[PDB]
Chain length 311, copies 5
């Protein structure tokens, strides 16, 4: 149980394939996803050549311990994959066809800049390290790359599952490593964000603007402070479903901006009361009437600017 | 330890059965459930046949390693099932009777459209991959499909546990695959939703409508904004027990609609105050009196429309 | 190894005992508890009999693999128990004495009808399946059923740990099965519920009733709506520590009833204000004075009725 | 691989030691803690004795399978410990020195009566069950009991790690059992409780007492009800970090008492308003002025009484 | 399989290296982080030396069981590492090159004094215990210490991964132990704390100060008490993402200080109302006008003092 010997001086090519059976638990905060799939492997080992006439059988079936199997690992996994060998078939020339079903929790960074209208490219990196006897290189058998039609990732649309056919061959700790990039392209189902977060957040904001049709300071204070507290609750709710990013997200920008609108509404409500107490309500009336137009107009234009900067 | 050889050119039929011992942890957000059950398998292995009058023994008990056993897997599981072989019995003609007790976490999508008045069909998909020597096909032994009377899934009523007797035979990565669909039909116990969520949510809404019998703007603002905040708390509580769906749920629709009622109540309370300040209370009185009838009437008709669209 | 042969045609009796070492994690929502205990087993295997004189030993120790051991399982467990064999002792007549220490997560339904003044009977169901060679039946050795004095279940009082001595013998998948019921009787420590939930909930309710000694509508609206919101917080807190039941719990009934008291207090506060504005305060005064007696009296009588229906 | 035979009729003494490497995850609610430590064992096995002059070797190293090792278990663990044998060394007289590194989740009850100014004694109970051949007894080698200087338990001060040198020898299921008590003494770091919970809780209470310098009923109702709601939030926050106890904790007592102060403040605010409406403000003034002194004085004396009863 | 014998009396030097593949799950509350890395080991075993000419190979590949391998452990791990041996290679002079890929959960204390503008030094302590045959000492092969360019720790910047080349040699239970300190220097990405916590917290505080431009006690009480409650929500949110420390954190200090500002604002609002009721508004006006300057000035200076003490 050592690697197959080279006929000339070539590296050993291990053909690979990943067929997705299940996709689940895309954790946005952890930037992980769980996968259940078939991993297929194929390589020539002439030491396993046989005559179907003598052995009786046209294809030989082996146990993983009985023969040499390339040590294939995943780069971006939390722990080593849970695998169960399904089959090891050896054909007369010594071509090995290896099939395993595995499950793994994959680390794959996510770009939240356009959240909740974002798309992602999840990666599964396959790797093999070369041995001293000989260099091992990975290849993609496109016939053995795919996904079950029923594969569903709750809250996401699965677009494609493809592999970058050219491996990344590089040196690591004085030995060659051959890395393959399997890419799962997904797009977020933003639907539910509209009736659950976006519209309720707009309703409470518009409710605070009713203070521009009221001269009652005590009612105005209650309108703007109460809706601000509801906005804080939405800010907290949203930030619990997201990791801390060194950049602004689209939702983060809108949520932050809405604070400025609450802050300026408090200034307006204060200025209005102050002028009324100072017996200059004609002035207060001019500021309040302007605010009725300015607040929705500046809100609309600021949102057009933000949508433009982000999309 | 190779598959039993075919007498002619027929596929090997593996008769299956699942007997549920325990059902627990139906997680709505994760769309998973845990199961503890018996898995029974039966097939003919002529290489294992024996004489009943010569041997004296009617049945022979083997260890799993001693004989060939079909590699049966579950499609929609998180990780491979935890299984412990209970018994292996061989009849004189070579009919093998295999029994294992297993536990598994099953991925099965849920339809939340009618939540909390929803019914579901949970699936357990049994699968076998054919070997080079011969094709393996699955069958259902209805005599060995069932569930323990004590099987309880907290918050659900278990209706039936049946199997679709015709397997889905298809090619996958150049080998035949035979898939069986075991269906667990359940209906949600909606009882607790009435005193815990539905009635409290209706009470706070009706409390906001007392503002239509009050001329006090400051009290009205307090009534409508305070009850709105309580409604936000219920919206958040409900959405934490549910996943994000690319469709509207019945509860989601009602919760969303109730925001419109709070928004229009704020408009009414604002309009009423504005007219009183403008010394036109006769008008304000006509709008407030109309609102006393309009709000409960439109609420009832909108709910009839929603119940009709969803049921 | 095969089961011990019958001298005549009797079933093989496996004597059992469970000695509790640790009880922990009684999860009310999951309706599970974790257990760490000794499982003792005893049966006669004539094939292992020996003469004490020519052996020089009064007892013989064996490794589990060396002899036949009955396949004993738990019915109501999440996963198969984690077990470590402690000792296997054989007496001259071939009486085997087996002892293992195990840990398991047990599914046992709970009756929340009288919560938090409830008592429960937790079950541990022991089971054995019969073989073709012979019928295996379970028995209880009462001398080997017990619990360590230090066994504590946080938030509960342990009353007794007994076994129903007569097994439930029945056919399951065309083999007889012998089931024993081990019962752990516990009663909930309701102490903490009094200063943490019951009294705070009564205080906020009594605070809302101070509105019956106030003519200030604005203050009344603030008193009743603010305490209602605090009651919603307690309702949410309580329902998070409990599963959803298809029946009313004692606490659920009280919590639900207190909403009616808040709803009727809002009606009273509204009616009082309406009459004052309509220049009929003498009337409003009669309703408010009646409410001062009616609300505590109806609250006391409704609680006596509820306590009667539930206890 | 049977136990060492007795020279006379003495029990086999197994000398033990536990050296703590890591302490983590002290879970107050679960009353558990995780430990990573060295477990050292020593006993005489004359069958393993050798001559040091003729062997030329001072010590012999054995693999665990090669020799007899006592079955040592922990009483108060969730599951059996995860252990890795480090070394087995035999001296010429046959004295065996066993060393393993283990990790375990330990169940150890906590006394919350003085929380957050509490100290605890965590226990690790070592146990051995006597075999039929001979009685096994445990002993403490104080030279092999200790802890790493870097051992830190977040939020706690580690005082000492000692063992009660005299084992508890007792009969359990017709065999002797030898139990040792390893004690880890810890004291809670109460620092953070002062700026995060104690002072904020006192500030909101003192804010409610500003109502004794106000004649505005509407403002008073807002002051006392709003701060009460903040107190409910702190009550909930505190009770989430603690298990339910069948006794009063120091914090629980203070939190409960503060409700009485809010309840009596509401009565005072109600009585004051009622008298003002009844045109007897001179009286109301006497009650309000008395309350300014009574509330802080009774609060101070009640806290002195509570601190005395608990410390 | 015993350790390599010493030529003279020298300790065996085991050269080590850690190459980080993945860094994830830095848990601030638990003070843990998960790591996936290569562990490389190298030592001279003369008994394994060979002639390249005679053998016909320049390298010899062994299985871990075939040769002696040093028992290397991590000090600060929850459980023993999950390791898979990748390669073992022997050079003609007996120089062994061992490579394993492992995953571990590491305990490493964090200094929260400057949070969220903090930097940390995570430690991975490698350790080896000497055997009776010989003393084993650890060394760092700097050529085999590193990290993959794609190594990302969500919410942190990775600065460096270095090893302290001189081991900490010490006696533990009368055997030499050799400890190496691998240091991962990280700095927190404080960006998101600015729009999510810092600015919202400043906005609500500045909103409370609008009470210094209002004579309305009832509106003032609403402004200061409502924003205080929002501050309590932020205090709770922040303290949930942090462990309890026996020292003040920078954020903790600011959060605590902001309570004093709310408390003094309530005193000012009370004093102002009291004087107005006592018919001395000229005085109240002088205190309120001073407060408009004093509150922002003292807030700015207190923050400069705090930033100075902490940075
Ligand atoms: C307050 C702000 C309201 C939010 C407005 C929507 C944000 C937006 O502008 O959303 C835009 C995204 C589309 O994005 P896309 O095609 O994936 O982006 C890739 C863009 N490239 C390839 C051009 C670079 O969603 C939609 O289909 C719009 C439906 C949202 C309705 C919201 C109703 C309220
Ligand atoms: C505010 C609105 C309150 C909610 C009203 C019930 C919603 C509904 O209409 O519920 C309807 C479901 C019944 O559903 P079904 O027969 O399973 O559906 C299959 C229907 N087919 C066969 C026609 C397609 O619930 C019930 O049995 C009614 C009990 C609800 C009582 C709620 C009290 C308040
Ligand atoms: C607002 C409502 C106030 C709380 C009502 C108490 C509920 C109750 O009455 O609880 C009753 C239970 C006892 O019941 P038991 O032994 O389970 O019943 C078995 C009944 N048989 C045998 C008749 C069928 O509690 C107690 O020991 C009393 C403690 C109550 C303290 C209340 C403090 C305020
Ligand atoms: C509102 C209530 C305020 C709480 C006041 C502290 C409680 C207390 O009284 O704390 C007292 C405990 C001391 O107790 P000890 O040494 O553990 O007990 C052993 C006692 N024997 C040996 C006598 C039995 O803590 C301290 O070191 C005091 C520091 C607390 C500062 C609190 C600032 C507010
Ligand atoms: C309300 C208070 C507002 C927050 C004040 C900023 C915190 C601070 O003063 O932060 C200080 C740290 C600097 O830390 P450093 O260089 O890593 O430390 C090593 C320091 N030595 C080498 C001198 C010992 O952060 C910053 O770069 C400040 C950017 C944050 C601006 C937030 C504005 C809103
Ligand atoms: Cl892997
Ligand atoms: Cl499976
Ligand atoms: Cl079991
Ligand atoms: Cl143990
Ligand atoms: Cl380790
Ligand atoms: Cl030393
Ligand atoms: Cl040494
Ligand atoms: Na192999
Ligand atoms: Na087999
Ligand atoms: Na108010
Ligand atoms: Na056996
Ligand atoms: Na042993
Ligand atoms: Na070795």
């Amino acid at each position: 149980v050592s690697p197959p010997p080279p006929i000339a001086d070539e590296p050993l090519t291990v053909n690979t394939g990943i067929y997705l059976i299940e996709c689940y638990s895309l954790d946005d905060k952890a930037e992980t996803f769980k996968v259940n799939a078939f991993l297929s492997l194929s390589w020539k080992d002439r030491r396993l050549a046989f005559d179907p006439v003598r052995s009786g059988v046209r294809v030989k079936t082996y146990e993983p311990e009985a023969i040499w199997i390339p040590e294939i690992r995943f780069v971006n996994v939390e722990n080593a994959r849970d695998a169960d060998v399904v089959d090891i078939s050896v054909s007369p020339d010594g071509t090995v066809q290896y099939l395993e079903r595995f499950s793994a929790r994959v680390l794959s960074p996510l770009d939240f800049r356009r959240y909740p209208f974002d798309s992602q490219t999840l990666h599964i990196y396959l790797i093999v390290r070369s041995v001293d006897t000989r260099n091992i290189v990975l290849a993609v058998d496109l016939e053995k790359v795919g996904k079950n039609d029923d594969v569903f990732l709750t809250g996401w649309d699965i677009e494609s599952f493809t592999a970058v056919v050219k491996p990344a061959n590089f040196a690591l700790e004085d030995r060659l490593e051959s890395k393959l990039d399997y890419q799962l392209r997904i797009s977020r189902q933003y639907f539910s964000y509209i009736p659950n977060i976006i519209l309720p957040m707009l309703f409470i904001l518009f409710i605070s603007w009713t203070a521009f049709w009221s001269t009652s300071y005590e009612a105005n204070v209650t309108l703007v402070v109460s809706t601000l507290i509801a906005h804080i609750a939405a800010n907290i709710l949203v930030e619990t479903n997201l990791p801390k990013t060194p950049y602004m997200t689209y939702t983060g920008a809108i949520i932050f901006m809405i604070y400025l609108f609450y802050f300026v509404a408090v200034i307006e409500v204060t200025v209005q009361h102050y002028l009324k107490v100072e017996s200059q309500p004609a002035r207060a009336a001019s500021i309040t009437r302007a605010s009725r137009i300015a607040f929705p107009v500046v809100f609309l234009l600021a949102n057009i600017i933000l949508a433009f900067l982000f999309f």
